[PDB]
Design a protein around this ligand. Structure first.
Ligand SMILES: CCCCCCCCCCCCCCCCCC(=O)OCC(COC(=O)CCCCCCCCCCCCCCCCC)OC(=O)CCCCCCCCCCCCCCCCC
Ligand SMILES: CCCCCCCCCCCCCCCCCC(=O)OCC(COC(=O)CCCCCCCCCCCCCCCCC)OC(=O)CCCCCCCCCCCCCCCCC
Ligand code: HEA
Ligand code: HEA
Ligand SMILES: CCCCC/C=C/C/C=C/C/C=C/C/C=C/CCCC(=O)O[C@H](COC(=O)CCCCCCCCCCCCCCCCC)COP(=O)(O)OCCN
Ligand SMILES: CCCCC/C=C\C/C=C/C/C=C/C/C=C\CCCC(=O)O[C@H](COC(=O)CCCCCCCCCCCCCCCCC)COP(=O)(O)OCCN
Ligand SMILES: CCCCC/C=C/C/C=C/CCCCCCCC(=O)O[C@H](COC(=O)CCCCCCCCCCCCCCC)COP(=O)(O)OCC[N+](C)(C)C
Ligand SMILES: CCCCCC/C=C\CCCCCCCCCC(=O)O[C@H](COC(=O)CCCCCCCCCCCCCCC)COP(=O)(O)OC[C@@H](O)CO
Ligand SMILES: CCCCCC/C=C\CCCCCCCCCC(=O)O[C@H](COC(=O)CCCCCCCCCCCCCCC)COP(=O)(O)OC[C@@H](O)CO
Ligand SMILES: CCCCCCCCCCO[C@@H]1O[C@H](CO)[C@@H](O[C@H]2O[C@H](CO)[C@@H](O)[C@H](O)[C@H]2O)[C@H](O)[C@H]1O
Ligand SMILES: CCCCCCCCCCO[C@@H]1O[C@H](CO)[C@@H](O[C@H]2O[C@H](CO)[C@@H](O)[C@H](O)[C@H]2O)[C@H](O)[C@H]1O
Ligand SMILES: CCCCCCCCCCO[C@@H]1O[C@H](CO)[C@@H](O[C@H]2O[C@H](CO)[C@@H](O)[C@H](O)[C@H]2O)[C@H](O)[C@H]1O
Ligand SMILES: C[C@H](CCC(=O)O)[C@H]1CC[C@H]2[C@@H]3[C@H](O)C[C@@H]4C[C@H](O)CC[C@]4(C)[C@H]3C[C@H](O)[C@]12C
Ligand code: CUA
Ligand SMILES: [Cu+2]
Ligand SMILES: [Mg+2]
Ligand code: NA
Ligand SMILES: [Zn+2]
Lengths: 98, 514, 79, 84, 227, 58, 46, 259, 43
């Protein structure tokens, strides 16, 4: 038999490892482990880009298998467009909440 | 705070800075050694009156330029600065191990100094072949100090290689595949794989040399059934990958510089350029015995090494042609960095083609251990690596410093250097064809004219180097702060400003999957 | 049989650039033969070809070192 | 394929403990016996000062410079022969 | 030997070296063409205000950039490997001569018939006779019969050396415990010079090779006189 | 033995600004000082030994 | 925590250009001089 | 505050102390080989052991105690350890190359045969076969230890790991005894050179691997490992399998084929 | 690239001093050793 005696992650994981384990249980990704899936990227359905500040760098892979990534600062305010493909992105700032 | 920041660093940018400083200092040592070489040869007869000292100078020149100038600047300096910025990573995978790779180099350099200062130095050539490097022809501490210098440099670069591979594989944005990383990041990844596989074989070989010298082993000593040629196989099994290690990060930088100053969003034929660097890395492991065509090699072996060596020209040509295809249709900015890159393309090509001449074992019988080989590698390696470094340095100095160079001064520096290196090395082809041996302190009288001109060339490059130091001084003295950089949409390393904050990408980039 | 001996001919056993084993084999063949013709009272003249071939190919210092080691009882080949 | 038992198919740990005590440690016990039975000191061979053996190009950095690190006087001669 | 302001190889003394000269001319023409094409294309990419900065398809041009270089390499490899296998083909020498490398002089052994050996040292500059060549002359030259296939066996009694004669297309490393074989055939009488070609320490620059190629009958009398 | 990991987690997550190499307390500071003294003293002795080995001694 | 921005992300001061000229002179000059002084050392012990 | 999963490490002195320990050990070996003194070498070994102790202590503090090893950080450590093992394989490859070069073309100085004239190789069926059984057995026990850990079984993890360490120690003592008993030495030409340097580096790796397993034993005693999170144990097991495989190549190449 | 005007402009005279001192830091020590080579040999 197993006499047990080995702790589990549920019992002993701490710090950022624990925060990642508990957010993954709720299907949430505060530490950006997963690639976000694109919307249609129109003015009416822009890609929603979370941030803990008022700006965030976006890289846009305009077409599948493009080797060139298009990089730009997305600012809080009106949706901005990728300078290569015109796809729409909108910042959604938020306090670093629990 | 100073000690915590500069001695206890876990920051990729500050460690990159330490590498560039180290490499620049090492570059001055290597340069002084080169000028002593060309002073000994600058007129017929003896200058030093001591050919053991000449041989120590030649040996030290090579070790300093390869291990303390080129590799630290390209992999340590540009690698640490640029690779995390180009993939959106907050640091290297092993930020603390990163600091030990740096701090192993000053003691590595001290061991090599010590070797030159103790006894009569290590006058072996950078190949350190036994039995000349053995305990009868080189009794005393000098060769052992050289071996230990290489051990410390080997550990530095192996841990550096583990760090880069891990960083580039593990720390990209989750949507970015390897086929969305910039060519410079590929060039560092492939370089790191060659280091990981090649340096341990060098470490085994020189450890066997150390035991032959100190523990009465006879790996390389015929009296015990050993063989000097075994040493040569182990050395060059490392040594050929080493020459691709020295150029690959330069190929990466040249792809970025030509793309940038051509006003293009991307290099021509990205996947072709990835293929070419991987093909060069792979072929670089199966060609080593072209360094050994005169040791008494069977004809079938010579035929194989001739053929495998030549096919390296195919992937390399794809890169040269793709660089030209990148220029094609460009809005060309004639920046100093672009001049270094265009010089690189031409001079690398001349040196590559003399390589193809040497690959032919039948011609190599007559050209081996002559100044033709010296001409070959000062074109591909000395000019190629130095031109890529100077291009990189000029291009990215405002990113690292936050300050601009005077472009006019930078173009003057390029012109002087271009003249100096060509005057120095081009005539060495004539010396080689006409049969002047390498590793000579003096030459028959017929070789005087080309040696005189080559030594005059070396002084022109000296003037370029002194001018480079002043130009860096002028930038730090004037403090013209950078405002705006073009093409940030395809050059992520500039997007955090100049210089970037201590911590970048604390919040990662957003990249989705369409 | 083969007089007007000029030098050691091509030997298909040793066709490459390293001729160390050619020298060694002919040295062993001479001294084995020479041993066998004392042990059987016979005549050393039969061994002559091997003597000529090893004298042609072998460095003097190698022949001389091997001769010293046979006399000392430290020669590592089987004669 | 000099190895024939059915794939044991319970707890992983239970199977590997079974292999540890049922195959691995028995093999070590057996090889330990075989080594015990071929263990006795064999006759040391006649000394010949072969020039390819007992190499000394430099004195060792310990003792008198002439003894190897794990020098065994019963079976390791010096360049001049066995020690009395 | 080399002459002042020489650009190319020493004139060929052997038929193998003549083969190498024609192979070098062929290879050098390809090197000059490729380097000048690359320089020209650079100048061409840089001398127009016309622009095309959108994505360019690479597939078609990469075929040309791969197949053409491949053909060029084959056009070098074919004659290269012909000369290589030509060099290696069975020669039947008339004579065997050994050279032993030393720090810093060559020894020669001619032991086909009699025990002839001698040491060959550089003439110091202070002792040269008028018109003699600094760093090239030796006290005792390597006398050899002309127009005959000779087997040279090369080894060393100390460190590595290398035994070279550029005008005969010869370079063979001198490795202790190893006996390397090369073949030598001079089309011409004369003096043919070479220099140690593997770094062997402080006097590497100062242990030259001088071959003296003469009719067999002079070679035979010289040999008998050197016993 | 007993699982005391929760105690160590509390000690090492204490919001006291100390780097991880000093965060265990006074013993860290002593082992740090001994390591750095041996390294810097040993390095000074290696430089002395270089100085010595760089010149002949009859 | 650490100083940020131009002239602060370096282990040497650029606060005064003449002090910087002295530091750069000693740094690069010490590198370039060293092999000359090692050759001198090797010539003198002989 | 970061919103990535990667570890920003506190500024550390251990890289500098490690680099300086490399200078003291190498200049120390130089002083030992040439100037008849062990002083620098003993300082070097001492600072090296202090550096490794404090560095790996801090990694345990960062992971077990502070929670910095997210899955992304753990995946990086996996790559690092595999790449490290690859570099060690290529190190050993150099020694196998030297052995095959020497043994396939035995020179006249050896008698033109392998083993050389005057060499009496060990019987591969005696202690070398025992050494083989011991390291193979230790690969089975460490696998038992790994499965016990993943199934949450503290006592059986500790028993299996103890058995693994004991076999490591047994191999080391068997090899030290073989070294003492061997009638050839490292000075016995290329046979002794290839034998002792190749098995000697392997022996060093066994001692390092055993030390690593002993660290894991003490970390298991103090409950550091979870049933799902224990990279240090996995790394030690990969390294231990590496040591086992290198032994099998030595045994087949040097002891068996080269006898 | 665009930049601000220099915070601490370096005049032509200041550049002549920077260049002169840079060149002398390379030339004088090496010059001194190379001038005294003959003295070193007699030791
Ligand atoms: C070329 C690299 C960069 C530029 C370098 C600039 C500096 C050099 C100038 C620029 C010189 C132009 C290049 C051609 C060499 C001229 C000598 C020659 O006729 O060479 C002849 C051959 C051998 O031929 C023979 O066996 C016959 C000898 C004929 C005897 C006549 C004697 C009279 C000679 C008078 C002296 C003149 C020598 C010039 C002496 C020059 C001293 C510096 O030599 C050889 O094999 C040497 C070949 C070396 C291999 C290097 C790779 C070549 C690619 C570089 C070219 C770039 C293309 C763009 C070309 C444009 C680039 C500017
Ligand atoms: C309590 C404090 C005391 C702490 C103890 C230290 C003292 C601190 C002072 C006092 C602290 C208080 C704050 C004052 C700030 C510094 C003042 C200064 O100007 O102080 C000067 C500092 C800094 O100096 C250096 O580091 C050397 C460089 C000097 C000028 C270089 C300019 C070159 C620019 C061009 C390069 C382009 C590349 C960059 C391009 C990128 C730019 C972003 O001096 C030193 O005391 C440095 C001590 C070691 C630091 C690590 C340096 C890395 C080594 C470099 C490789 C050497 C190769 C030898 C190899 C050896 C082998 C033999
Ligand atoms: C990267 C490698 C490299 C570099 C750059 C150089 C640079 C130079 N080298 Fe050489 N050299 C070798 C590698 C290199 N070398 C090797 C491997 C050997 C063989 C040794 C042996 O046989 O064992 C050799 C041998 C060699 C010989 C043959 C000696 C002989 O056979 O006896 C000669 C002769 O002229 C020579 C000359 C020169 C000169 C004049 C320069 C330079 O003066 C020319 C270009 C000038 C520079 C001044 C470089 C400046 C760069 C910097 C200062 C960095 C700045 C840093 C930043 C901006 C961050 N070198
Ligand atoms: C940057 C460093 C570097 C690089 C990249 C190279 C690249 C190559 N090198 Fe060289 N080499 C050295 C550094 C380098 N080398 C050093 C340091 C030595 C001497 C070491 C010593 O002894 O100390 C040496 C020695 C050396 C020798 C041994 C010579 C001897 O000692 O006798 C040989 C033999 O084949 C060789 C071959 C080549 C070839 C074939 C390439 C190929 O990779 C080059 C391919 C490139 C091109 C061909 C140009 C671009 C291509 C095109 C434009 C396409 C069209 C071209 C054709 C169809 C031909 N090199
Ligand atoms: C120098 C070399 C170094 C080598 C190191 C030394 C190794 C030898 C021993 C080491 C320590 C072993 C002690 C055994 C203690 C066990 C305590 C844990 C037991 C436990 O709690 O687990 C139970 C095991 O019980 C059971 O049968 C018991 C399970 C079996 C345990 C003991 C088995 C005996 C092993 C002997 C080894 C053989 C070697 C050859 C010697 C032959 C001599 C006879 C669970 O039972 P279950 O799976 O539900 O069903 C069992 C019924 N079949
Ligand atoms: C189970 C084995 C026990 C562990 C080992 C115990 C003690 C010291 C050994 C250190 C481990 C290093 C291994 C490799 C080095 C050399 C060979 C050592 C192998 C060995 O121990 O071999 C002994 C010789 O040791 C000798 O000479 C010398 C002994 C020590 C000299 C120190 C050598 C230092 C070499 C530095 C190597 C640096 C390279 C590292 C690469 C790093 C990557 C860059 C053999 O004894 P013997 O009397 O000849 O013959 C037996 C006759 N009865
Ligand atoms: C040792 C051996 C030496 C080897 C050297 C040999 C080199 C061979 C080179 C041959 C190249 C021939 C191809 C011609 C390309 C020229 C560049 C260019 O600009 O080509 C364009 C083609 O690009 C398009 O469209 C389609 C998009 C992709 C265009 C692809 C252009 C390829 C560019 C290659 C340039 C190579 C330069 C240097 C080579 C070393 C022309 O645009 P157009 O408006 O006419 O067409 C579009 C028309 N619409 C839009 C109205 C429909
Ligand atoms: C002849 C005498 C020459 C002597 C030269 C000796 C040189 C230096 C001696 C000092 C070395 C001792 C110090 C211990 C170093 C431990 C490195 C380590 O363990 O590095 C780890 C990464 O490498 C990994 O995993 C996997 C890689 C682990 C590497 C282990 C250390 C190896 C040291 C020697 C390597 C030799 C190279 C191989 C060729 C033989 C951790 O990376 P850090 O960035 O720290 O932290 C990351 C944090 O997230 C952890 O929480
Ligand atoms: C002559 C003197 C020479 C040297 C002698 C002795 C040398 C070394 C002693 C042996 C090495 C001991 C290594 C101890 C490492 C302990 C730290 C550790 O194992 O750290 C782990 C990370 O792994 C990691 O860094 C992985 C780090 C792995 C390090 C790899 C070690 C191999 C180094 C060997 C050096 C070889 C040199 C060979 C000579 C050529 C921590 O993560 P977990 O375990 O998941 O814990 C977290 C959970 O608790 C959360 O729930
Ligand atoms: C000779 C040296 C020793 C070889 C070492 C091999 C290294 C293996 C590392 C641990 O991995 C496990 O090993 C077995 C893979 O073959 C499997 O065992 C177990 O897997 C099942 C479930 O765990 C059980 O039902 C089985 O009975 C049991 O064999 C299991 O899948 C696998 O994860
Ligand atoms: C904080 C770390 C800094 C520590 C600095 C330590 C400095 C210690 C310096 C003195 O030690 C020297 O080293 C050698 C070894 O101790 C001695 O030589 C000796 O070496 C041999 C072996 O011990 C003797 O047998 C020789 O006779 C003898 O010259 C020498 O005399 C002794 O002065
Ligand atoms: C490859 C590197 C290139 C180096 C090229 C160096 C160019 C020369 C720089 C000048 O260096 C100085 O030259 C003086 C001579 O012009 C030397 O003075 C020497 O000669 C003077 C006049 O003969 C005496 O007044 C001095 O006292 C005596 O030291 C002086 O020592 C040396 O610093
Ligand atoms: C003390 C502890 C029981 C309490 C606990 O789990 O903390 C037990 C569990 C496993 C035990 C160990 C294992 O059974 C393996 C070893 C067995 C040996 O016979 C004694 C030492 C030995 C190393 C044991 C020491 C001690 O009895 C341990 C460590
Ligand atoms: Cu003999 Cu060079
Ligand atoms: Cu090569
Ligand atoms: Mg050579
Ligand atoms: Na000279
Ligand atoms: Zn887009």
């Amino acid at each position: 038999a197993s006499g047990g005696g080995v702790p589990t992650d549920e019992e002993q994981a701490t710090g950022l490892e624990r925060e990642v384990m508990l957010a993954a249980r709720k299907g949430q990704d505060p530490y950006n482990i997963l690639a976000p899936k694109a919307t249609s990227g129109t003015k009416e359905d822009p890609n929603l880009v979370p941030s803990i500040t008022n700006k965030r760098i976006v890289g846009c892979i305009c077409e599948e298998d493009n080797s060139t990534v298009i990089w730009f600062w997305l600012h809080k305010g009106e949706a901005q467009r990728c300078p290569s493909c015109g796809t729409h992105y909108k910042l959604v700032p938020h306090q670093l909440a629990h | 705070m100073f000690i915590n920041r500069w001695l206890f660093s876990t920051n990729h940018k500050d460690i990159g800075t330490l590498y560039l400083l180290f490499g620049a200092w090492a570059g001055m040592v290597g340069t002084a050694l080169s000028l002593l070489i060309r002073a000994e040869l600058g007129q017929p007869g003896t200058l030093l009156g001591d050919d053991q000292i000449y041989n120590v100078v030649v040996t030290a020149h090579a070790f300093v330029m390869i291990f303390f100038m080129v590799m630290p600047i390209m992999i340590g300096g540009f690698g640490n600065w640029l690779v995390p910025l180009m993939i959106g990573a907050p640091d290297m995978a092993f930020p603390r191990m990163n600091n030990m790779s740096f701090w192993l180099l000053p003691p590595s350099f001290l061991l090599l100094l010590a070797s030159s200062m103790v006894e009569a130095g290590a006058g072996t050539g950078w190949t350190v072949y036994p039995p000349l490097a053995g305990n009868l022809a080189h009794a005393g501490a000098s060769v052992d100090l050289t071996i230990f210098s290489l051990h410390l440099a080997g550990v530095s670069s192996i841990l550096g290689a583990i760090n880069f591979i891990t960083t580039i594989i593990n720390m990209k944005p989750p949507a970015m595949s390897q086929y969305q990383t910039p060519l410079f990041v590929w060039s560092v990844m492939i370089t790191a794989v060659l280091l990981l596989l090649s340096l341990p074989v060098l470490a085994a070989g020189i450890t066997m040399l150390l035991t032959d010298r100190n523990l009465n082993t006879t790996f390389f000593d015929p009296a015990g059934g050993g063989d000097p040629i075994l040493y040569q196989h182990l050395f060059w099994f490392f040594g050929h990958p080493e020459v691709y290690i020295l150029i690959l990060p330069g190929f990466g930088m040249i792809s970025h510089i030509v793309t940038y100053y051509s006003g293009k969003k991307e290099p021509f034929g990205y996947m072709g350029m990835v293929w070419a660097m991987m093909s060069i890395g792979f072929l670089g492991f199966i060609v080593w015995a072209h360094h050994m065509f005169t040791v008494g090699m069977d004809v079938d072996t010579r035929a194989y090494f001739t053929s495998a060596t030549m096919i390296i020209a195919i992937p390399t040509g794809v890169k040269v042609f793709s660089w030209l295809a990148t220029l094609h249709g460009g809005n060309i900015k004639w920046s100093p960095a672009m001049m270094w890159a265009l010089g690189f393309i031409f001079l690398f090509t001349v040196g590559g083609l003399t390589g193809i001449v040497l690959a032919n074992s039948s011609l190599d019988i007559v050209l081996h251990d002559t100044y033709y080989v010296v001409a070959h590698f000062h074109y591909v390696l000395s000019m190629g690596a130095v031109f890529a470094i100077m291009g990189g340095f000029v291009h990215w100095f405002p990113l690292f410093s936050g300050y601009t160079l005077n472009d006019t001064w930078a173009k003057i520096h390029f012109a002087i250097m271009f003249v100096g290196v060509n005057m120095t090395f081009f005539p060495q082809h004539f010396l080689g064809l006409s049969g002047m041996p390498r590793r000579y302190s003096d030459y028959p009288d017929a070789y005087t004219m080309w040696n005189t001109i080559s030594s005059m060339g070396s002084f022109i490059s000296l003037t370029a180097v002194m001018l480079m130091v002043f130009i860096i001084w002028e930038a730090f003295a004037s403090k013209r702060e950078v405002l705006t950089v073009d093409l940030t949409t395809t050059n992520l390393e500039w997007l955090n400003g100049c210089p970037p904050p201590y911590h970048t990408f604390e919040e990662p980039t957003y990249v989705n999957l369409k | 049989k083969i007089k007007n001996y000029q030098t050691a001919p091509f030997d298909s056993r040793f066709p490459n650039q390293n001729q160390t084993r050619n020298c060694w084999q002919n040295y062993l063949d001479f001294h084995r033969c020479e041993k066998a013709m004392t042990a059987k009272g016979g005549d050393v003249s039969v061994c002559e070809w091997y003597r000529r071939v090893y004298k042609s190919l072998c460095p003097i210092s190698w022949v001389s070192t091997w001769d010293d080691r046979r006399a000392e009882g430290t020669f590592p080949g089987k004669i | 394929a000099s190895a024939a038992k059915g794939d044991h198919g319970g707890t992983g740990a239970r199977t590997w403990r079974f292999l540890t005590f049922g195959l691995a440690l028995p093999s070590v016990a057996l090889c330990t016996l075989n080594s015990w039975l071929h263990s006795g000191h064999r006759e040391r061979p006649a000394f010949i000062p072969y020039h390819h053996l007992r190499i000394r190009t430099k004195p060792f950095s310990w003792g008198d410079g002439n003894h190897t690190f794990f020098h065994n006087p019963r079976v390791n001669p010096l360049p001049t022969g066995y020690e009395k | 030997m080399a002459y002042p302001m020489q650009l190319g190889f020493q004139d060929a003394t052997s038929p193998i070296m003549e083969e190498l000269l024609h192979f070098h001319d062929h290879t050098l023409m390809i090197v000059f063409l490729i380097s000048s094409l690359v320089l020209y294309i650079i100048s061409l990419m840089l001398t127009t205000k016309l622009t095309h900065t959108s994505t360019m398809d690479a597939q078609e041009v990469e075929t040309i950039w791969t197949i053409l270089p491949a053909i060029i390499l084959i056009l070098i490899a074919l004659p290269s490997l012909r000369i290589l296998y030509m060099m290696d083909e069975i020669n039947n020498p008339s004579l065997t001569v050994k050279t032993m490398g030393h720090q810093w002089y060559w020894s020669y052994e001619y032991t086909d018939y009699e025990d002839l050996s001698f040491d060959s040292y550089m003439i110091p500059t202070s002792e040269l006779k008028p018109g003699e060549l600094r760093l090239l002359e030796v006290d005792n030259r390597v006398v050899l019969p002309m127009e005959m296939t000779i087997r040279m066996l090369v080894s060393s009694e100390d460190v590595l050396h290398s035994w070279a004669v550029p005008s005969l297309g010869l370079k063979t490393d001198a490795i202790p415990g190893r006996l390397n074989q090369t073949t030598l055939m001079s089309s011409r009488p004369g003096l043919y010079y070479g220099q140690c070609s593997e770094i062997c320490g402080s006097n590497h620059s100062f242990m030259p090779i001088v071959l003296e190629l003469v009719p067999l009958k002079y070679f035979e009398k010289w040999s008998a006189s050197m016993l | 033995f007993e699982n005391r990991v929760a105690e160590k987690q509390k000690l090492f997550q204490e919001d006291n600004g100390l780097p991880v190499h000093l965060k265990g307390g006074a013993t860290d500071n002593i082992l740090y000082r001994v390591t750095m003294t041996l390294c810097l003293g040993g390095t000074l002795y290696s430089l002395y030994c270089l100085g010595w080995a760089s010149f002949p001694h009859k | 925590h650490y100083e940020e921005g131009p002239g602060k992300n370096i282990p040497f001061s650029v606060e005064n250009k003449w002090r910087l000229l002295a530091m750069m002179t000693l740094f690069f000059g010490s590198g370039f001089a060293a092999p000359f002084f090692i050759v001198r050392h090797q010539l003198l012990k002989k | 505050h970061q919103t990535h999963a990667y570890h920003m490490v506190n500024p550390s002195p251990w890289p500098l102390t490690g680099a300086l320990s490399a200078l003291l050990m190498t200049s120390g070996l130089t002083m030992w080989f040439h100037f008849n003194s062990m002083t620098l070498l003993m300082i070097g070994l001492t600072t090296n052991m202090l550096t490794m102790y404090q560095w790996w202590r801090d990694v345990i503090r960062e992971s077990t105690f502070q929670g910095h090893h997210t899955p992304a950080v753990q995946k990086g450590l996996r790559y690092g350890m595999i790449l490290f093992i690859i570099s060690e394989v290529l190190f050993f490859t150099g020694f196998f190359w030297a052995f095959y070069h020497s043994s396939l073309a035995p020179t006249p100085e050896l008698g033109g045969c392998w083993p050389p004239t005057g060499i009496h190789p060990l019987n591969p069926l005696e202690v070398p076969l025992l050494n083989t059984s011991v390291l193979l057995a230790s690969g089975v026990s460490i696998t038992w230890a790994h499965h016990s850990l993943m199934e949450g079984d503290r006592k059986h993890m500790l028993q299996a790991l103890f058995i693994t360490i004991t076999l490591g120690v047994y191999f080391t003592l068997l090899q030290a005894s073989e070294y003492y008993e061997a009638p050839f030495t490292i000075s016995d030409g290329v046979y002794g050179s290839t034998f002792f340097v190749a098995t000697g580096f392997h022996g060093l790796h066994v001692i390092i691997g055993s030390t690593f397993l002993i660290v894991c034993f003490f970390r298991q005693l103090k409950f550091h490992f979870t049933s799902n999170h224990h990279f240090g144990f996995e790394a030690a097991a990969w390294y231990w399998h590496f040591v086992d495989v290198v032994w099998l190549f030595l045994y087949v190449s040097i002891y068996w084929w080269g006898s | 690239i665009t930049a601000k005007p220099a915070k601490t402009p370096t005049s032509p005279k200041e550049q002549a001093i920077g260049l002169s001192v840079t060149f002398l830091s390379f030339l004088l020590p090496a010059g001194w050793v190379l001038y005294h080579l003959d003295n070193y040999k007699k030791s």
